[PDB]
Structure formats: structure tokens, C-alpha cells
């Protein structure tokens, strides 16, 4: 399953400093937790490195439940828990994960580069021929990861006074894909995210930022 679910109540009860650090800088903390989970699993199972080589930690029962209408710039870069109804869901797309490039001037295969969620990885020179010139994805030596966008809106029962429901995009990666379905009512834990490539710099209006939730844990609300 390559994914370990950690209860936030248990983490806080055992060690409260990590739990208090967790929602303030979850990108770094979840990176650390993934490395430590890999170590503990490989210690327990030596032969599991040829299965996944990456363990994802999903934080559960986070107490910071904010409804979609209440996310602000205060919440940016923080682990939030929200609930809502999945309204749309792309197909599982393959996203570059450890991308190898071809120098299409000398055909050298430029070593694996990590693909962050924030920006396109663009190589500099070719290590061999030192060309800045065009590269291309080596799609045979690249490893990919599963990607899926969902739109989640507030449950119509929650939106109440006479006002419209609010929706956020969420990104499910590599285990979380196909865990939701248009119509599902879910609990979403993720990092409220600001900084990838959407900032409206095109003078098409005010310098506002598009935000997304990097889903970290998805919990449906139903029988199975």
C-alpha cells in the first residue's frame, strides 16, 4: 500500500512538539515523516525497498477543521482539514516524478530530477556537450506518479444562510487517486497551497493568487 496513516491524536498524545509543528510547516514535516517511515519499514521489512521505495504518511483526525468558506491567506502553507462534496474529478494522469531528459543535440540522458509540485523542472546545460539547447523528456527512463484533480465544494446542507457554496481544487497524488468520486462527501486533509504558477500576472486584473489543496489524507463519509 506504500502509505502509512498516522492518527494526529496519537501523535500529539505521545509527542506534542511534532504535532504542534506539523500543521505549521507540513511540507517539511511530512517529508521528514516519510523518510522516517521508510527507515522503520525497511528495518522491519528489508525486502520492501523493491516494492515502493517511498512511504507516504497520511495524517488522520486533525482537529483543525475549517470549512471551505473560511480559508484565508492566514492558512497558506498549513495543514488544514476540510469537508465537502466532490463535484468533479479528472482521470488519473501520469505526472513526472523523477524525470530523465534527453539532450537532443548529443542524446545524453540527463539524470533524474525531482519534480516538485511548484514548478516545471527545466535542466540547465547538458553535462556532456554543455548545450543549453532543447531537451526532451526521456519517457522510458522517467518514472511517473499518479495525479488527479478534484473539485470539492461545501456540502449544500452546511451552506445555510442563503449564499453560495464555495469550492476548492485539490490534488491527489499516487495513492489518493481514485479514492473519491463525483458525488462523494469526503474529509480532506491537505496543505493550503499558493505558490506554483497561478498568480494572475497577466494584468487581466488584480494580482490575486489561485490556491489549491495538496491532499494528504482523504476519508470518505459512508459505508464501504
Amino acid at each position: 500500500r506504500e502509505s502509512l496513516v498516522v492518527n494526529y491524536e496519537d501523535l500529539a498524545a505521545r509527542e506534542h512538539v511534532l504535532a504542534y509543528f506539523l500543521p505549521e510547516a507540513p511540507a517539511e514535516l511530512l517529508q521528514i515523516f516519510d523518510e522516517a517511515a521508510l527507515e522503520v519499514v525497511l528495518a522491519m521489512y528489508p525486502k520492501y525497498d523493491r516494492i515502493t521505495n517511498h512511504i507516504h504518511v497520511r495524517i488522520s483526525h486533525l482537529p483543525l477543521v475549517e470549512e471551505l468558506r473560511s480559508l484565508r491567506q492566514l492558512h497558506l502553507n498549513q495543514l488544514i482539514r476540510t469537508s465537502g462534496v466532490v463535484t468533479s474529478c479528472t482521470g488519473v494522469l501520469p505526472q513526472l516524478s523523477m524525470v530523465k531528459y534527453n539532450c537532443n543535440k548529443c542524446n545524453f540522458v540527463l539524470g533524474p530530477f525531482c519534480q516538485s509540485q511548484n514548478q516545471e523542472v527545466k535542466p540547465g546545460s547538458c553535462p556532456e556537450c554543455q548545450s543549453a539547447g532543447p531537451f526532451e523528456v526521456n519517457m522510458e527512463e522517467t518514472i511517473y506518479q499518479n495525479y488527479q484533480r478534484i473539485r470539492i465544494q461545501e456540502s449544500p446542507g452546511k451552506v445555510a444562510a442563503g449564499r453560495l457554496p464555495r469550492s476548492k481544487d485539490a490534488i491527489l497524488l499516487a495513492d489518493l487517486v481514485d479514492s473519491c468520486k463525483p458525488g462523494d462527501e469526503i474529509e480532506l486533509t491537505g496543505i493550503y497551497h499558493n505558490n506554483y504558477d497561478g498568480s494572475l500576472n497577466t494584468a487581466n486584473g488584480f494580482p490575486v493568487f489561485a490556491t489549491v489543496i495538496l491532499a494528504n489524507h482523504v476519508a470518505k463519509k459512508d459505508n464501504k
Binding site: 527545466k122 523528456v137 519517457m139
Partner: peptide, 11 residues
Amino acid sequence: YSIKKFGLTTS
């Protein structure tokens, strides 16, 4: 099963 390789552009 392949991806389109038209130059790593079109952002």
C-alpha cells in the same frame, strides 16, 4: 502508453 513530446513548453 505514451506522453506527447512536443518540447516541454506550453505552460
